Write a protein that binds this ligand. Structure first.
Ligand SMILES: NC(=O)c1ccc(Nc2nccc(Nc3ccccc3C(N)=O)n2)cc1
Length: 265
């Protein structure tokens, strides 16, 4: 951070999304005419929720980390009643939004996204940084439709022990993280497995009706496949969704897997 801004250095545009922490707007840096996103968070919420650190972690990590499949953080600043985050703007929304718009993905999008995601993680891991929050809602699409990871607030360094009171949903977390135990760079691989299954099926493999119900499904790795899911896909998903973190593939193994290579553009 060599420069410091102010809400006045921008021209806020249309609202992009989010709700309770604050909203995200399309922004235009007056000086340069640079387009970007401006996620505005209210101090009121921050404090009362005690996220001071996740925010610090987000602005922390995402500031340094620089990769084409990771969403950039350009800086931040806060006015009297809130904090602003200067973010890379991703022209094609979230992957979460695309999935609603398409229901399920073909083996090509699925394969591709997984690839871009692996490279980004492969890089994140380079720096012993585990995301631990890879869900389709934290995946944006670039001007060329490329995946771009965001939200490293829940992201920390590994190995780790943190038990952090709740995540809203357990869908993307692996047994270790739910079971409250120690975890590492492999948490991101179980998630990669979940995303893959979801992308092709339209629902995460452990979806349940109750938090409790899902924790059961997860903790026992109980998942089945629709008939349309091909064996190549099944193989890789079954390899990523291993109870034992140490039995999950390394990102290169994933990046070389036949089905991935046979369909990733
Ligand atoms: N409504 C759309 O077509 C649309 C949605 C999203 C983007 N891209 C984008 N880039 C950077 C940040 C960002 N923030 C968020 C927007 C919505 C929800 C959550 C966030 C967020 N806290 O990351 N969104 C572009 C268009």
């Amino acid at each position: 951070k060599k420069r410091q801004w102010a809400l006045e250095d921008f021209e806020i545009g249309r609202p992009l999304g989010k709700g309770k922490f604050g909203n995200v707007y399309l922004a235009r840096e007056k000086q340069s005419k640079f387009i970007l996103a401006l996620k505005v968070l209210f101090k009121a919420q921050l404090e009362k929720a005690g996220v001071e650190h996740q925010l610090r972690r987000e602005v922390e990590i995402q500031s340094h980390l620089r990769h084409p499949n990771i969403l950039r953080l350009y800086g931040y600043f806060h006015d009297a009643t809130r904090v602003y985050l200067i973010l890379e703007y991703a022209p094609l929304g979230t992957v979460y939004r695309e999935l609603q718009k398409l229901s399920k993905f073909d083996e090509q999008r699925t394969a591709t996204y997984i690839t871009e995601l692996a490279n980004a993680l492969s890089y994140c891991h380079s720096k012993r940084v585990i995301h631990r929050d890879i869900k389709p809602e934290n995946l944006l699409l670039g001007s060329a439709g490329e995946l771009k990871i965001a939200d490293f607030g829940w992201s920390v360094h590994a190995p780790s022990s943190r038990r952090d009171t709740l995540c809203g949903t357990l869908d993307y977390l692996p047994p270790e993280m739910i079971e409250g135990r120690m975890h590492d760079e492999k948490v991101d691989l179980w998630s990669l497995g979940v995303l893959c299954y979801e992308f092709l099926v339209g629902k995460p493999p452990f979806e349940a009706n109750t938090y409790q119900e899902t924790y059961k499904r997860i903790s026992r790795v109980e998942f089945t496949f629709p008939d349309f899911v091909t064996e190549g896909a099944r193989d890789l998903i079954s390899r990523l969704l291993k109870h034992n973190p140490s039995q999950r593939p390394m990102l290169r193994e994933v990046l070389e897997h036949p089905w991935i290579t046979a369909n990733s553009s």
